[PDB]
Amino acid sequence: PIVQNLQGQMVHQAISPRTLNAWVKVVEEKAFSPEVIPMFSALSEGATPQDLNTMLNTVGGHQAAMQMLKETINEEAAEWDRLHPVHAGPIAPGQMREPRGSDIAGTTSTLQEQIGWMTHNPPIPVGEIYKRWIILGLNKIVRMYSPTSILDIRQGPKEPFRDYVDRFYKTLRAEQASQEVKNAATETLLVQNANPDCKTILKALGPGATLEEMMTACQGV
């Protein structure tokens, strides 16, 4: 992002390799979860357009998602330009030429220009604007490849099994799913998602173990 010299200039500092590594870990682990979006926003705090593109190149192997981001970015850039028509006249010594859509996406603009816009009084916040376009894109990605569920409800290593059951069923009840899907959830996913020690106990019960029998079996595991 942007930092000030002891000589007073606003200069660019590349994103830390640790911030970058975190972002790449988030994407690796949080596939296409709604959870990616808040993380992306936290990790990209202060980012210039150049920095944002740096983050995206790091997860570019996701080609279908990158394609979706491209189309969103092109769309928003096109609307920006409609709202911000080019003005050919001279620029007064105390004005600054406005960014185009491609300047915001970092395509036709330099880091120096991005910093000049971002730190103007008041700012032309091209980092924040580009970040919004990316977020629009990410929301479209999750919404396209992501249904609601209970799949990530997992018993904690020290979680009492009765508490896990409660969470599981609460999540279950609030979903809009067919009964046959919910039947699989109660009869198989609950055990599937129990912790290692409880699952092993649960899987050694009989053919017709009742949930009460399950709770009895896993109490204090």
Technique that determined the structure: NMR
Residues 118 and 199 reside in one and the same domain: no
- Cα dihedral across residues 54, 47, 2, 127: positive or negative: positive
d(CA 102, CA 81) in angstroms, rounded, equals 9
Tell me, yes or no, whether 10 and 96 share the same domain: yes
Question: Which structural domain, as residue segments, surrounds residue 125?
Answer: 1-147
Domain CATH code at residue 165: 1.10.1200.30
Number of domains in the chain: 2
Amino acid at 145: Y
Query: Two tokens at 124?
Result: 């032309």
Torsion sign, CA atoms 13, 15, 17, 19: positive
> Which amino acid is located at 89 in the chain?
G
Which one, of 221, 220, 214, lies nearest residue 196 by Cα?
Answer: 221
Q: Is 89 buried (19+), middle (13-18) or exposed (0-12) by CB count in 10 A? A: exposed
Report the C-alpha gap between 137 and 123 in whole angstroms.
24
| Other C-beta atoms lying within 10 Å of the C-beta of residue 209 | 15
Question: What's the chain look like in SS3?
Answer: CEEECCCCCEEECCCCHHHHHHHHHHHHHCCCCCCHHHHHHHHCCCCCHHHHHHHHHHCCCCHHHHHHHHHHHHHHHHHHHHHCCCCCCCCCCCCCCCCCHHHHCCCCCCHHHHHHHHCCCCCCCHHHHHHHHHHHHHHHHHHHCCCCCCCCCCCCCCCCHHHHHHHHHHHHHHCCCCHHHHHHHHHHHHHHCCCHHHHHHHCCCCCCCCHHHHHHHHCCC
